[model samples]
Target: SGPVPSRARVYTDVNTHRPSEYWDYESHVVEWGNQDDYQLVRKLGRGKYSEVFEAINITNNEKVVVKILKPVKKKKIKREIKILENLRGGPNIITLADIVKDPVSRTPALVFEHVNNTDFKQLYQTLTDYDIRFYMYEILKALDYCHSMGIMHRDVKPHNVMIDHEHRKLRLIDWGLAEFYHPGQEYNVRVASRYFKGPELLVDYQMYDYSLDMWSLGCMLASMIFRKEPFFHGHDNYDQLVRIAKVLGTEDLYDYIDKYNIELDPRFNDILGRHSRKRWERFVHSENQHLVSPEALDFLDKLLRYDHQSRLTAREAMEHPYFYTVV
Candidate 1:
């Protein structure tokens, strides 16, 4: 209900407790005496930096997703642990039940309460308009709560939002790239997935705000409804801009270019800032004419604004008509 405090301050609580040696894989299992307690049923999936396994928490006898950090990336492992420790309590957020050291591998493993339903990506495939609106309301609510707490979820994608098997609750997971937003600060330039990136990011704007998350949310919503990826379909940055121009039209192109003012690659000059108003109007009107409601489309337009300052903040987005109607 009110603004939440930054959990960044508590990162040290877990960071300071680094084990002397990498977790000793063998001794940890023997000493903990719960080798058979938690049974690793099967591998859930694997990522570049970690592997996820579905396990039965023998002590609690509940299903959980155990994310094991690869032995090589100690820094990433430490960061994940610290972040999880700070985000322990929120229900809308994924719960990190236990931070344990793997006995044999001596690696860090994060035990998360398992969410049953497929991720947003899969959910989108089968969802009705009502389902999409329902889930988006939950997502905006969770994001608003996170932002209120001074946490910026740098990565907001379909895959990161999990739906419970019962389809009643939604949880936001994957905090690896989350950061605290400081007003007037020049944020990092590390680009997330191109398709979901904000306009400011695409234009290489140095200064940014929490609205980048909204931009990604807009793209995700569009993708879900239209069943087509928005922008960044190109092989390179130039091509991405061209793809954007093709969809968004040229009026915003010059506005976008002037706002960011970065030198573009030679290829982009051919189509940069060149769309007619009629063309853009037709494109926007035609693309969203079918399934999505007007309220959702209006909120999405704000999120996908060309200027960062114009984008909707988490709080503003939560107050949008779409959420009010659905929730």
Candidate 2:
């Protein structure tokens, strides 16, 4: 163990105070719904973990999503179901309606409340300044709720954020990589996707917490404001840190490493050459000048800190001036 054990700065003991059954996924029982009730109308998209579909409940003719999970371990399946159950009523959290199992293959599917989402690439293109503020604030609502409940949404990229722009509704989807927070616990560093991975993940720092989501949010916000799909576009995991270091600077990364007693992988010795941290304003230009403002830059800077604990919490982020008038 290191001299300084990294712990979440806020909502550290939420799981500790709750009943063990709440977070204990292994023992959770599944009351599987009848698979026959839902009919797959169209295939939505396939992911590493599941294949999603636009389905309908035959009895009521209602639209819904059927997430046919891949052949994963029972433990993984149980965790997703349990986490969704615990977070069902939270604002902006995706709603899980029913759990069904294919009688033939024993495959399980998660039925979710339907969201007529516009693809993020297309949606972001149409978002006005107020729309961006409105949606980012909405995402913060979801992140704050999950963090307050002691859960870390390891994946917080645009793909995981579903926006039904027509209805002006937003939902944070995909809890597959989400996990409960325990103080002083060491978690797997391989949680988030490459472009959104925080320095804590890339540097082999395992004692990270809910602040991981904030960094991903920062990346998402930067992409929207600067018109970049991913603020940090790393080719691989190793290069991911390099991309971040180039923008955030190498010295700040070293300082963060020293604080947590993190030892960078030797592979980084050559690639992570000296680079000065670039200003947030440097990224703003004629193309994205409309979205860039004093408060926007200030907010992005706060959330993209090299130090995880220094990043703004979801609640704290909501209080920032950028969100003062999201209407």
- Candidate 2 lDDT trough over 10 residues, lowest sum: 1-10
Instruction: Estimate TM-scores for all models.
Output: 0.79, 0.98
Model 2 lDDT per residue over 19-63, tens place: 989888899998998889999999998888999999999999999
Model 1 / residue 178 / CA error / Å: 1.2
Global Cα lDDT for candidate 2: 0.92
Candidate number with greatest lDDT? 2
In terms of lDDT, model 1 sits at 0.65
